[PDB]
RNA sequence: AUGCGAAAGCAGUUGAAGACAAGUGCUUGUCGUUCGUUAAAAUGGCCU
């Protein structure tokens, strides 16, 4: 004797654009939250060591949010003018913040009382500030002077290394993970520069012609750079020193860009981008950077960032809207005598000779309609299938199963008008869809065959059939012009 | 260990072992060289058996027990053949036999000569200055049995006819427990409680050599021509001395060492091994008492050998009459459709008031919301003019998007029908130029073929419904 | 009721009726404990042990109308589990073998009989075996090539058997039907489960493809039409279960059955592809998306001729480029890359179509050189380097009307190193064709002009394949599995 | 150079040839309940129960006697009618089997024992009518047979003993019925 | 030396058995395990260890086929709806009983089963039998060799315990008399050869809260005999009752008075009674409570007098839960909660 | 339901005798009966 096969629920033939696992993941990112700020929001960052925090820049307001309660946890506001950008050290204790007056404040996280150091670079406003990622005492900044300056936080006074060769309004840079000596700068005239520090550095090692003003640059690999500039964005390789791809599947200039990897996801690595149109998209660097997901917020979304790879906590997705809106979308995550009495439970038998097991796996819920099918209660199974809160698809598989076993007239013999009417209501609802149409058509055929005389009698049933006839003529028509347009397909091949 | 004592037959093919089973000694013989659980129990709950031996024509064994008596026990016949007795109430310590003479040795230092075939006590016997004694053996003098050996920590050589000791070699500290004649010139003494074995030479009466074990010795056996010595050792191990009687060579080391280990890392001991000319037998215990054997060629094995034996330690009960997982091998695995993708052979794949500007914008980009607005847009004239202003490639992707939209949201189909109609109307030339029309237009194809497939049964339902409708409306 | 017994002490009444269940009736309480699923009908059942330890019972497996197919069971009563499940190779044929009769129930269906129905059926069946000159007996039988295991496409359930142990190892349902959750009685018996038409293995040996059809319940609007389903199953080379990777409904459109399946050569897709050949002339080629995780169609050629031929065949060159579709009366060579006639730019009389004497039922290729085509009149061996027929062989007398088109292809099979073997069968007539038969089998060579070797066997031969160490296996009406070796 | 032979065996040879359903089962289990005996169409198999294994398979193509009894190519009429464990000739020799053909043939073999090329052959006379049943209580045997003069069958009961002389099987007409329809 | 001392036991020890023929000690406790020990005076070693999964044990007994005696079973049951059975050398052969033939509502848990023997008496073959404590009178009675459902009987009130009694009659002829006991103090006595009828019913004197019953002296499920020639008729009846009392009864006159009088009362104990057992002879009555340490005593019969030099305050007993003599050797193995059995050997045996 | 055919369809088919039951020698039925041809019921459901 073998166990009882489960009644297999039906699957329709597939429809185009099935929901992919990527869609499951990135739409499960949910439970949106909105915060209104004073002014535009420029830069966003996350704390790398214990990912439980992220930082937001704004007009004279640097706010630290906690990954646990999504409210502001800390505020820095000693800023005399518009603070541009915030960056957390690769070991977290310390953040840098580049203002517009012409200086950077570098001081340790969680302590707005200490201005640990104030460094005065060139007097022009500084748009970009960051920490290194291979050294922890080297901090990079640039200012409208188009010269990017590397300071060593041990020496506050002289630029540890000035760096020129740019063109106009330098506003991005990044480091190369593998090489602790290689720095890429996104100038604002395009033409990405690549520098090696251990040389003189006056000129870049080389340049890349990203024709539009390029806005952002990230190192996705020790070998691959992602360049956010203009309407499209491009991906470059280092050793070959040639561009690899572009994606331009947006409306406006791509604006914000960030890469994450090696985190729990059916996708191994992810790249997210912000394109001025509510549209933030998720690509992967393994499918040649194809579009995988997207959201739309109203205003021009200027910044975007994700919780890093070792979040181990409720993951977050931060978007900054030039309309002055911070938005976040997240995914959440007896008595001692009695025990000395019966202490034999938590043993599981490690150290005996031969271990037997036989217990049956706890099978899933046996629904009532399946139960009626099992116990031959065909009419009861049908009525259960027509109780309200059941899924249309499951009801369809129920009807298909009953037809396949063939007890159709069986389940319908004892039926009286009060029993028919829920059947007929579902019939009227279901006739519209395709597979639903076929099966319900068969069913109503046999219903008519049995119940002509009671149809004569009952007044309600007659208007039921009237409505049925209206709908069936309508769909007959729609099918007809459907066949006409397939006719044009055949022509216009 | 629970195997209190045991010994092979000469030639080592059956082993007789004595162990206790709930207040009774029981003896059992089992084969080694290719289960017979016929065991013999001692009826008395008190008395034990002190020593055992074999006898070769009919084969049997000999049991010297506490009572002061001897049993000659038939092996195949479950019975002691005869109950030899000494005229006293004492305790038999050892026995020995060769030919027909039998000699047994008391604790009270009584010696006894017995005839087997006569079932008789030939002679009681006792001497001077053998105050304590626990070992007896008799030498290979032919059929003569003169100059036998007794021992208690000082080995004594004695002749029978004049009834006096001759040679006393310096023994060990403990009582001695094994005394076996190696050669007509040499005999081995193994004193229990020590790792040191004494090879002694008889005529010179002198200490030839000393042999070192590594743990304490329990059992000694020797091969045919002093070729090898096998020692079962108390931690549970086998020590093999090869040619120990050759050329300070006074102290000689264990040449070869043997242990027994299961796969789970457990160690199990050996007890009463047996060796022969290029043939080695080892005995051990699977369960508490079931004896098991292994035969091998020690001449080719390395100097140190760690035998591995498959034992069922934590193995799991894969019952044969079942599958690996519950099921039984007469079932029939059912219809587990599982998560298969399902498809049909119609998914042809893998082979003036206008809004033209905004629709083309959204399709260059991709926005469900903006597309949804321009689709709630209605006026047919507007749709026509837009498609006229539209560019072909955007038109093609428009067809794909619209058909997908229909496929999901069926109800919208009508207005989307007129949309797709105008689209393929206006932009026919470019698409007839572009080759891979089936795959490029895929979803529209499959959607419309599905509806086509609907048509005939739909007609069937329509006609039956007319039949019934006229039926009841006529009256 | 089919079987009855009392146990040795008699307080337990075993009942072994039709519905796949055995009941144990405790007499005194007038009650019952009963085993409700046992893979067929209890033809016999009794208690065996001197104490009541084991039950024995003989089962029918009545799904197969073609033959009453017994199966034996010794059953530990204590657990009510099965200690001995004795089996047989259980094929299914075109028509019932000599003097095999459906058992008895309250009604007469295509599975059961009434009593006067039983007698009348018996006499008419014997008369038909005497009279008709259309009878045939041949069945698809398939070789697991990497494990060399016989598969029988028993209806809706595959039976995995093998000779090396002489024993069946597995029995798997492959149909979303009425498969096991039911003991059919009368009109469930009227109904019949969907039918497995074809089973093939991918040459690589990690896939089956199965084609099956399903029939609606009788007497209703949807009854007249059919439906045809195709299913791709995976498994790893060690377990003994099959996992349905991808199902396809209605290939080539509704009621457009796939008539023949060709696994792809190793060359094209590591043998990870298949061809479905219709009864219209349409040809589809299915492959496996590996960057996705499924099978899908990739290369089609869809003509819809206004004629129907139930007989088709097709073959593929080892190169993976030359494809030979023999539709009725005409063969065509097609390029794999274009699926079109191989145009002769040189025009060396290598015309893309061969129009033959008769409709083609079988095509095969031995090498890059020789094509073997059986028309129900003749066998024809044609050279390919020079477009001329090498050998003709008169077969028309041997096969007059005793075959429904489409079985000679699995009768004739060819060693792809050495050659091919012919299959002819006859019944000796005595002054009238008797029941006994006789089959001559001649091993033919690559040229076919020389007969490699003739043999003759008595009992009717129902199938042949060839084990891939260049030897051959033949399946006989009696489940006597025989071998032709070197 | 090419050998064509029969190797694998199927069909189990029910007692359908009766069709009157005396006892459709024919197999019997061992005296030591480790072994079961299933006579197929072409070979008789020994099934060991603690591992579900056909230990040895007894083809009918090796020994000519079985080939002469069941493998005559003119007609397959001769086939098993019964099978017992003990030995008819000597009382309590063990590894013995006795097989009974419809056509009066009794053949004695050695299950788990090499088939010596002289298995104990015996024939039963009086079988102008066909045989249907053979069985025994202690010592004594009874046999049922089918004969005729309604498309029905006369069942002749005989008492069977053995050895007035070696080949001779003593048969006496116990009883008879003219037209049976069901009989268990 | 502690039997368990060979290979520890991680829970209480819930039941013990001495195999009737070979020297084997079966120990089973809520560790979901089974252990079989070979018993020396000195060196008890771990013969085997069958550890289930997802099942406790609350009684495991040896049992021998009475007609074959080359077949020995071990019957395991916990608080579930099944009883495992184990046959008797590489990886074991274990079967299950779970299938009640419609009498299912009675026995919702198999936690109290006693194994016995029975002869059919029309045919005179014997088979093993398993008795099951049920709901409100239902002793449900299963055919051991088969797994079927033989017969059901119902004592009234609430069942609390029972026992098996034997009578020989003539050569190869005997009869099993179930003796069941509702808590209140009403004792039924059914026979089993003929289907379950009430041979005789009586009221125990006093004994309100009655929990255990045993018989001893002849043969019984604690000293199971070897062949039907070895079956004797039992002599001593013990009713151990909740407050700590034991009433000892002489069968010869209890049966023939049918409203008997206790022959003696033992109330040295003070806590709840759990285990009554006898030595195979019937000379020693071992009683043992379960609610406190040091709670065991032995009683001399027919004196009906408690022994007074054992066990003293230096007897490392612990909360005794299972009392097991051995048939021949003279051992008494006692199993306490802390996870250890302990041995004592009696010398007079 | 036979043959032929495609998943359509095209042709063809429904004979007697015997027997027995019920009914008034006669009416109906029935068949564990024959030859001849291509020939809906017993309140009664699936284990742990």
* Radius of gyration from C-alpha coordinates of chain C: 25
Q: Sort A246 into a burial class: Cβ within 10 Å, 0-12 / 13-18 / 19+.
A: middle
Relative to beta strand D28-29, strand B217-222 is unpaired
> CA D156, CA D173: separation in Å to the nearest integer?
7
CB C47 within 8 A of CB C27: no
C39 burial via Cβ count (<10 Å: 0-12, 13-18, 19+): buried
Here the tokens at position C273 are 């592809």
Query: A442 and C220 in contact by Cβ < 8 A?
Result: yes
Residue listed under structure tokens 């060629």: B297
Whether the Cβ atoms of residue E266 and residue E306 lie closer than 8 Å to each other:
yes
Question: Using the 8-state DSSP alphabet, how is residue C221 labeled?
Answer: G
Q: Residue A155 burial (CB < 10 Å; 0-12/13-18/19+)?
A: exposed
> For residue C22, which of C53, C8, C1 has the smallest C-alpha distance?
C1
Chain E residues near residue C80 by CB distance under 8 angstroms: 99, 147
Secondary structure string (H, E, C) spanning E1-37: CCHHHHCCCCCCCCEEEECCCCCCEEEECCCCEEEEE
Q: Is C111 exposed, middle or buried (0-12, 13-18, 19+ CB in 10 A)?
A: buried
Angle, alpha carbons C1-C5-C10 (nearest 5°): 140
Alpha-carbon span E134 to E138, nearest angstrom: 5
Give the separation between CA A456 and CA A451, rounded to whole angstroms. Answer: 9
CA distance A45 to A58: 12
Q: How far apart are CA A77 and CA A86, in angstroms?
A: 13
Residue count of chain C: 486
Q: A192-196 and A182-186 as β-strands: parallel, antiparallel, unpaired?
A: antiparallel
Scanning the structure block, which residue is given the tokens 């007409």? D173
Place of tokens 């005409």: C330
Q: Which of A1, A403, A404 sits opposite C38 (nearest CB)?
A: A1
CA of C435 to C1' of F1 (A): 24
Q: How many CA atoms lie within 13 A of B400 on its CB side?
A: 19
Place of tokens 């860009």: A257
Closest nucleotide (CA of C33 to C1')?
Answer: F47
Per the CB < 8 A criterion, the answer to whether C260 and C279 are in contact is no
Per the CB < 8 A criterion, the answer to whether C114 and C107 are in contact is yes
CB B215 within 8 A of CB B234: yes
How far is it, in rounded angstroms, from Cα D108 to Cα D106?
7
Task: Kindly report the nearest CA distance between residue A4 and chain C, in angstroms.
Answer: 6
* Burial of B57: CB neighbours in 10 Å, binned 0-12, 13-18, 19+: exposed
Q: Do B350 and C296 touch (CB under 8 A)?
A: yes
* Pairs across A and B, CB distance < 8 A: 164
Lookup: nucleotide whose C1' is closest to A3 CA: F47
The CA–C1' separation of D21 and F21, in angstroms, is 29
Cα(A452)–Cα(A462) distance, integer angstroms: 10
Q: Find tokens 């030919």 and name the residue.
A: B99
Q: What's the CA dihedral at D159, D163, D165, D169 to 10 degrees?
A: 40
Residue closest to C193 by CA, chosen among C4, C361, C64 = C64
Report chain B's C-alpha Rg in angstroms: 49
By C-alpha to C1' distance, F5 is nearest to C310
User: How far is E334 from E274, CA to CA, in rounded Å?
Assistant: 13
A22 backbone dihedrals φ, ψ, rounded to 5°: -55, -45
**Cα separation, D99 vs D115, whole angstroms:** 14
Q: Is the peptide bond preceding residue E311 cis, with omega within 30 degrees of 0?
A: yes
Task: Determine the distance from the C-alpha atom of residue D11 to the mean position of all C-alpha atoms in its chain, rounded to a whole number.
Answer: 16
Contact B66, B92 (CB under 8 A): yes
Rounded to whole angstroms, the Cα distance separating A281 from A275 reads: 8
Q: Do chains A and D touch (3 or more CB pairs under 8 A)?
A: no
- Which technique was the structure solved with, according to the deposited record? cryo-EM
CA separation for the pair B153, B194 (Å, rounded): 12
* Chain B neighbors of A479, CB-CB under 8 A: 451-452, 454-455, 458
Q: Tell me whether residues A354 and E32 touch, CB distance under 8 A.
A: no
Q: Which nucleotide is nearest to C253 (CA to C1')?
A: F7
Q: Find where tokens 């181990």 sit.
A: A312
Q: List the single protein residue with the shortest CA to C1' distance from F19.
A: D150
Cβ burial, residue E139 (10 Å; 0-12/13-18/19+): buried
Residues of chain C that touch chain B, judged by Cβ-Cβ distance less than 8 Å: 39, 73, 81-83, 85, 157, 170-177, 179-180, 221-222, 231, 241, 243-254, 284, 287, 289, 293-294, 296-300
Both tokens of C292, joined, read 């996705």
Which residue in C362, C361, C359, C355 sits closest to C414, CA to CA? C362
Helical residues (DSSP H) of C101-254, grouped into ranges? 115-131, 187-190
The resolution, in angstroms to one decimal, equals 4.6
* Helix or strand holding residue A472 (H, E): helix A459-492
Alpha-carbon gap: C128 to the closest alpha carbon of chain D (Å): 21
Chains that touch C (3 or more CB pairs under 8 A): A, B, D, E
A338, A344, A358: best to mutate for the E interface, most E CBs within 10 A: A344
Q: What Å value separates CA C18 and C1' F44?
A: 15
Distance from CA of D163 to the nearest CA of C (A): 31
What is the DSSP track for D81-145? EEEESS-SSSS----EEEEEESSSEEEEEESSS---S--EEEE-SSTTSEEEEEEESSS-EEEEE
* Paired sense of beta strands C360-365 and C370-375, if any: antiparallel
User: Which of C222, C294, C298 comes nearest B341 by C-beta?
Assistant: C294
Q: What gap in Å lies between CA A167 and CA A146, rounded to an integer?
A: 7
What span, in angstroms and rounded, lies between the C-alpha atoms of C21 and C11? 19
What is the DSSP-derived secondary structure letter of residue B471?
Answer: H
């Amino acid at each position: 004797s073998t166990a009882r096969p489960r009644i297999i629920t039906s699957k329709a033939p597939l429809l185009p654009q099935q929901t992919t696992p990527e869609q499951r993941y990135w739409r499960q990112y949910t439970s949106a939250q909105l915060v209104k700020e004073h002014n535009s929001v420029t830069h966003i960052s996350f704390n790398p060591q214990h990912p439980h925090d992220f930082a937001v820049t704004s007009s004279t307001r640097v706010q630290i949010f906690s990954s646990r309660t999504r409210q502001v946890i800390k505020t820095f506001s000693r800023f005399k003018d518009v603070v541009y950008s915030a960056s957390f050290r690769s070991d977290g204790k310390l953040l840098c913040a580049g203002d517009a007056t012409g200086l950077v404040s570098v001081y340790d996280s969680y302590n707005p009382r200490t201005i640990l150091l104030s460094i005065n670079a060139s007097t022009h406003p500084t748009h970009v500030t960051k920490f290194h990622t291979q050294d922890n005492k080297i901090l990079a900044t640039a200012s409208d002077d188009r010269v990017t300056r590397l300071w060593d936080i041990s020496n506050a006074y002289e630029p540890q290394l000035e760096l020129t060769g740019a063109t106009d309004y330098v506003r991005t840079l990044s480091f190369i993970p593998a090489a602790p000596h290689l720095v890429a700068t996104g100038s604002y005239d395009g033409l990405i520069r690549l520098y090696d520090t251990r040389s003189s550095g006056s000129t870049p090692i080389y340049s890349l012609n990203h024709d539009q003003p390029v806005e952002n640059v990230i190192a996705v690999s020790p070998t691959q750079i992602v360049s956010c500039g203009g309407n499209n964005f491009k991906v470059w390789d280092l050793t070959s020193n040639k561009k690899l791809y572009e994606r331009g599947n947006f409306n406006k200039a791509v604006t914000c860009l960030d890469y994450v990897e090696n985190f729990d996801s059916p996708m191994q690595s992810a790249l997210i981008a912000s394109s001025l149109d509510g549209h933030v998209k998720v690509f992967d660097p393994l499918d040649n950077f194809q579009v995988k997901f997207g959201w739309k917020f109203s205003g021009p979304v200027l910044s975007c960032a994700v919780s890093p790879s070792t979040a181990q906590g409720n993951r977050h997705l931060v978007a900054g809207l030039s309309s002055g809106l911070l938005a976040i979308r997240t995914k959440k995550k007896k008595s001692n005598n009695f025990q000395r009495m019966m202490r034999g439970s938590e043993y599981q038998g490690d150290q005996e000779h031969i271990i037997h097991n036989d217990k049956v796996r706890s099978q899933r819920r046996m629904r009532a309609f399946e139960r009626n099918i099992n116990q031959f209660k065909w009419s009861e199974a049908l009525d259960n299938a027509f109780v309200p809160g059941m899924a249309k698809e499951l009801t369809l598989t129920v009807l298909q199963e009953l037809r396949k076993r063939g007890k159709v007239r069986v389940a319908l013999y004892g039926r009286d008008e009060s029993t028919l009417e829920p059947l007929l209501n579902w019939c009227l609802k279901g006739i519209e869809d395709v597979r639903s149409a076929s099966i319900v058509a068969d069913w109503v055929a046999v219903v008519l065959e049995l119940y002509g005389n009671t149809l004569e009698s009952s007044p309600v049933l007659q208007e039921l059939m009237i409505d049925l006839k209206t709908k069936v003529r309508h769909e007959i028509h729609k099918s007809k012009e459907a066949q006409r347009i397939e006719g044009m397909l055949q022509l216009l091949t | 260990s629970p195997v209190l004592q045991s010994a092979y037959d000469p030639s080592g093919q059956y082993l007789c072992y004595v162990t206790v089973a709930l207040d009774k000694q029981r003896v059992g013989v089992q084969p080694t060289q290719r289960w017979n659980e016929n065991f013999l129990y001692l009826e008395d709950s008190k008395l034990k058996v002190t020593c055992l031996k074999w006898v070769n024509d009919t084969v049997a064994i000999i049991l010297g027990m506490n009572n002061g008596e001897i049993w000659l026990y038939s092996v195949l016949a479950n019975e002691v053949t005869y109950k030899f007795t000494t005229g006293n109430s004492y305790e038999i310590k050892d026995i020995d036999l060769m030919g027909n003479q039998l000699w047994c040795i008391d604790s009270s230092d009584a010696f006894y000569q017995f005839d087997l075939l006569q079932f008789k006590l030939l002679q009681h016997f006792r001497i001077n200055n053998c105050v304590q004694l626990n070992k007896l053996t008799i030498v290979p003098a032919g059929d003569s049995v003169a100059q036998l050996l007794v021992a208690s920590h000082s080995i004594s050589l004695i002749d029978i006819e004049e009834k006096k000791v001759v040679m006393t070699f310096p023994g060990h500290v403990s009582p001695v427990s094994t005394l076996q004649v190696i050669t007509n010139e040499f005999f081995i003494s193994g004193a229990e409680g020590d790792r040191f074995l004494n090879v002694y030479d008889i005529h010179s009466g002198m200490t030839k050599c000393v042999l070192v074990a590594e743990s304490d010795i329990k059992e000694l056996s020797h091969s045919g021509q002093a070729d090898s010595i096998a020692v079962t050792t108390e931690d549970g191990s086998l020590e093999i001395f090869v040619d120990p009687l050759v050329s300070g060579n006074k102290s000689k080391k264990s040449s070869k060492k043997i242990q027994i280990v299961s796969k789970d890392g457990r160690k199990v001991p050996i007890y009463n091994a047996f060796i022969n000319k290029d043939l080695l037998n080892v005995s051990w215990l699977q369960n508490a008492t079931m004896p098991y054997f292994k035969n091998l060629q020690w001449r080719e094995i390395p100097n140190e050998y760690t035998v591995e034996i498959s034992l069922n330690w934590n193995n799991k009960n894969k019952s044969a009459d079942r599958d690996l997982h519950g099921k039984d091998l007469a079932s029939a695995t059912n219809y587990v459709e599982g998560n298969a993708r399902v498809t049909s052979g119609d998914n042809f794949k893998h082979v003036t008031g206008t809004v033209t500007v905004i629709l083309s914008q959204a399709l260059q980009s991709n926005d469900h919301s903006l597309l949804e607005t321009v689709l709630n847009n209605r006026d047919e004239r507007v749709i026509r003019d837009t498609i006229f202003r539209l560019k072909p490639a955007l038109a093609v992707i428009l067809l794909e998007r619209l058909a997908e939209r229909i496929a999901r949201q069926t109800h919208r189909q009508g207005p989307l029908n007129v949309w797709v109609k105008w689209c393929l109307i206006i932009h026919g030339g470019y698409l007839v130029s572009i080759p891979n029309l089936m795959s490029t237009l895929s979803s529209l194809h499959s959607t419309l073929k599905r509806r086509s497939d609907l048509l005939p049964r739909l007609l069937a339902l329509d006609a039956r419904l007319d039949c019934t409708i006229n039926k009841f409306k006529t009256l | 009721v089919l079987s009855l017994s009392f146990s040795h002490d008699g307080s337990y009444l075993l009942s072994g009726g039709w519905e796949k269940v055995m009941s144990l009736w405790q007499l005194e309480t007038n009650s019952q404990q009963f085993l409700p699923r046992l893979n067929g009908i209890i033809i016999d059942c009794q208690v065996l042990g001197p104490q009541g330890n084991y039950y024995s019972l003989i089962l029918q497996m009545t799904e197969n109308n073609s033959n009453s197919d017994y199966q034996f069971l010794l059953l530990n009563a204590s657990d009510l589990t099965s200690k001995l499940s004795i089996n047989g190779p259980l094929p299914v044929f075109n028509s019932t073998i000599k003097h095999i009769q459906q058992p008895i129930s309250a009604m007469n269906t295509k599975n059961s009989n009434s009593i006067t129905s039983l007698n009348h059926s018996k006499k008419k069946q014997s008369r038909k075996l005497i009279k008709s000159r259309r009878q045939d007996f041949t069945t698809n039988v398939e070789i697991n090539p990497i494990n060399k295991n016989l598969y029988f496409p028993h209806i809706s359930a595959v039976q995995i058997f093998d000779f090396y142990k002489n024993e069946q190892v597995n029995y798997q349902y492959l149909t979303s039907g009425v498969n096991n959750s039911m003991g059919k009685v009368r009109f469930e018996l009227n109904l019949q489960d969907p039918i497995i038409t074809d089973l093939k293995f991918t040459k690589d040996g990690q896939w089956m493809i199965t084609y099956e059809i399903e029939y609606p319940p009788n007497d209703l609007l949807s009854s007249k039409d059919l439906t045809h389903i195709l299913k791709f199953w995976t498994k790893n080379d060690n377990e003994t279960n099959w996992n349905l990777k991808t199902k396809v409904i209605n290939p080539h459109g509704i009621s457009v059955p796939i008539t023949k399946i060709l696994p792809s050569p190793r060359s094209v897709n590591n043998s990870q592809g298949c061809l479905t050949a219709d009864n219209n002339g349409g040809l589809k080629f299915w492959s496996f998306d590996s960057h996705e995780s499924n099978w899908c169609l990739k290369k089609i050629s869809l003509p819809n001729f206004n004629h129907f031929s139930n007989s088709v065949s097709l073959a593929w060159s080892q190169d993976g480029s030359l494809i030979f579709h023999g539709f009725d009366d005409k063969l065509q060579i097609l390029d794999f890359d274009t699926f079109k006639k191989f145009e002769s730019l040189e025009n060396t009389k290598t015309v893309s179509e061969f129009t033959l004497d008769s409709e083609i039922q079988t095509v095969k290729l031995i090498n890059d050189t020789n094509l073997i085509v059986a028309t129900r009149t003749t066998l024809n061996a044609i050279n390919l380097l020079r477009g001329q027929v090498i050998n003709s062989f008169d077969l028309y007398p041997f096969v007059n009307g005793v075959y429904k088109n489409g079985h000679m292809d699995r009768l004739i099979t060819c060693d792809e190193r050495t050659g091919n073997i012919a299959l002819v069968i006859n019944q000796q007539l005595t002054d009238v064709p008797t029941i006994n038969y006789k089959s001559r089998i001649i091993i033919f060579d690559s040229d076919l002009s020389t007969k490699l070797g003739n043999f003759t066997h008595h009992e009717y031969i129902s199938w042949i394949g060839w084990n891939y160490d260049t030897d051959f296996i033949f399946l006989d009406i009696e489940s006597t599995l025989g071998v032709v070796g070197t | 150079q090419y050998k064509l032979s029969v190797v694998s065996g199927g069909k189990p040879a029910l007692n359908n040839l009766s069709s009157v359903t005396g006892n459709k089962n024919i197999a019997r289990l061992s005296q030591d309940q480790r072994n079961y005996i299933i006579p197929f169409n072409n070979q008789i198999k020994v099934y060991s129960v603690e591992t579900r294994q056909c230990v040895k398979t007894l083809k009918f193509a090796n020994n000519s006697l079985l080939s002469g009894i069941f493998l005559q190519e003119e007609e397959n009429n001769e086939s098993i009618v019964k099978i017992l464990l003990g030995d008819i000739t000597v009382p309590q020799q063990a590894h013995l089997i006795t097989v009974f053909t419809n056509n009066g043939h009794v053949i004695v073999l050695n299950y788990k024992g090499k088939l010596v090329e002289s298995p104990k052959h015996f024939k039963i006379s009086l079988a102008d009518e066909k045989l249907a049943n053979v069985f025994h209580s202690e010592g004594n045997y009874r046999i049922l047979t089918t004969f005729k003069d309604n498309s029905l069958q006369s069942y002749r009961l005989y008492a069977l003993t053995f050895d007035d002389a070696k080949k001779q099987f003593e048969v006496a007409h116990q009883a008879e019925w003219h037209n049976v329809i069901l009989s268990n | 030396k502690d039997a368990n001392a060979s290979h520890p036991s991680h829970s209480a020890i819930q039941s013990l058995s001495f195999h009737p023929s070979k020297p084997l000690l079966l120990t089973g406790g809520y560790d979901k395990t089974l252990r079989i020990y070979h018993i020396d005076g000195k060196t008890n070693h771990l013969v085997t260890s069958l550890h289930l999964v997802g099942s406790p044990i609350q009684t495991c007994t040896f049992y021998t086929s009475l007609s074959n005696q080359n077949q020995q079973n071990i019957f395991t049951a916990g608080r579930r709806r099944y009883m495992h059975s184990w046959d008797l050398s590489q990886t074991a052969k274990i079967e299950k009983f779970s299938r009640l033939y419609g009498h299912e509502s009675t026995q919702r848990s198999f936690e109290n089963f006693k194994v016995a023997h029975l002869q059919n008496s029309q045919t005179n073959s014997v088979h093993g039998i398993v008795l099951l404590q049920g709901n409100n009178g239902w002793i449900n009675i299963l055919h051991s060799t088969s797994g079927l459902w033989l017969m059901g009987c119902k004592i009234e009130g609430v069942i609390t315990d029972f026992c098996i009694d034997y009578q020989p009659i003539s050569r190869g002829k005997f009869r099993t008399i179930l003796i069941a006991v509702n808590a209140y103090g009403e004792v039924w006595e059914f026979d089993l050869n003929k289907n379950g009828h009430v041979i005789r019913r009586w009221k125990d004197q006093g004994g309100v809260g009655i929990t255990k019953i045993q018989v001893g002296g002849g043969t019984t499920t604690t000293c199971p005999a070897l062949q039907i020639s070895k079956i004797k008729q039992n002599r001593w009846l013990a009713v151990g009752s909740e407050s700590g009392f034991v009433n000892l009864y002489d069968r010869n006159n209890a049966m023939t008075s049918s409203t008997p009088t206790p022959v003696a009362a033992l109330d040295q104990l003070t806590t709840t009674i759990s285990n009554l057992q006898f030595s195979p002879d019937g000379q020693i009555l071992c009683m043992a409570s379960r609610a406190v340490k040091d709670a065991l005593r032995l009683v001399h019969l027919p004196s009906c007098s408690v022994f007074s030099n054992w066990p003293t305050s230096g007897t490392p007993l612990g909360k005794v839960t299972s009392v097991a003599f051995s048939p021949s050797g003279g051992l008494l193995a006692v199993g306490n909660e802390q996870g250890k059995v302990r041995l004592w050997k009696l010398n007079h045996y």
